[PDB]
Symmetry: D2
Subunit: 113 residues, 4 copies
């Protein structure tokens, strides 16, 4: 199945947070309606927090892509809703051979404020 | 049900990341085996990222506590496992009256590295 | 936080499946727009499957209530989305003192077909 | 990533429940330690419930396999823990071209009783 693809409410601001756990430099790109709208990069094995960016969901079509070593990482993803209100969309990714799926972890959340 | 309490693998390092979305200053404490092991605080309505701290799970008994305006916030939580490997334990919290449950969002993840 | 309350897409058919793990007889009621629309009852400690019923979500406001021993059970719930398409809304419940939260398990899923 | 594979607590009884939503006859096999331990089959587009079977997790290595039209369906999966106690492992599957991932839905839950 496709992974890292989420339908958000239209025209909503959402946060994107990235954590890294790899020796390979990670490159995360967030697409909204197929347009490149947020980028992160970093490296480190101690859950290195690359910060949070807030962007708008456009029509709602959001996609996460992660690269390392010049190639697309393998993705795994899910969406969770807590208290019928708090949404988290989570992506884990694997750049190598150990199947730890923590090399980049991308968290989308909404609503904000 | 109790919320914000998780059983982790014993003696594992895990990351804790906090985002805030409230006018009230948030105070997060992470307990391991009933002892305080990590603190965060901050205020903001823009999904403001308080950083990540790595701590050890001890026997595995981890509890997230969130306080604002001198009162423990109402918590909601769950744990997700992706690819049979990546664990996220998520806590939303409500400090007020709007039931948005985003006032502090606390994310635990393991394994690291 | 309120638990067992979910916002579904409007006017959608969804399935409700109930499993029981208790010596106390369980009574599950599904409300749609505050109206009583599906009922299940049963007992047993071996994950006894009470079947699946398909009902319509109306405006989208769905609530799960569970009783045993004449009183409302304590609920815990979450919603999961897989492949950006398959929705499960899950309720666990506790009728007693052992905090196993399996006494009735209610699963809502959509879309069908 | 591999999907439909879960590590359960060792030697635990768990329930497996299957729902179908397809014109194609579904065949579900649950493997424990690489050995077949439970089968289900059926066909229907109405979230049709194939029942629940209880089996033992052995060493803990559980795999869900879903076949339709003689081909293994594409799987998506995750595990959820509620109240730090109730575990659900969920598998959606796609036998065709519409990407609805509901063709068989397999739900594992533990602990029982
Ligand atoms: C070389 O492998 C990459 O870096 C290592 C330090 C590990 O984080 C591993 O999971 C990752 O895939
Ligand atoms: C006063 O209420 C608090 O601050 C507001 C700006 C909102 O973030 C609200 O959710 C929060 O509970
Ligand atoms: C009397 O307690 C009820 O029945 C027992 C057999 C257990 O299933 C328990 O979890 C449940 O709360
Ligand atoms: C032929 O396609 C199969 O049957 C249809 C009735 C739908 O349930 C579809 O999702 C499924 O893949
Ligand atoms: Ca890796
Ligand atoms: Ca790694
Ligand atoms: Ca609030
Ligand atoms: Ca808020
Ligand atoms: Ca109980
Ligand atoms: Ca029970
Ligand atoms: Ca299909
Ligand atoms: Ca289908």
């Amino acid at each position: 199945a496709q992974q890292g693809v989420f339908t958000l409410p239209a025209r909503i601001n959402f946060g994107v947070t990235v954590l890294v756990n790899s020796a390979a430099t990670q490159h995360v790109e967030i697409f909204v309606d197929n347009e490149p709208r947020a980028a992160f990069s970093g490296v480190g094995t101690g859950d290195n927090n690359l910060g949070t960016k807030v962007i708008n969901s456009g029509s709602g079509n959001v996609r996460v892509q992660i690269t390392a070593n010049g190639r697309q990482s393998d993705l795994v993803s899910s969406q969770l809703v807590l208290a019928n209100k708090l949404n988290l969309a989570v992506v884990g990714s694997e750049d190598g051979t150990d199947m730890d799926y923590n090399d980049s972890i991308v968290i989308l959340n909404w609503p904000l404020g």
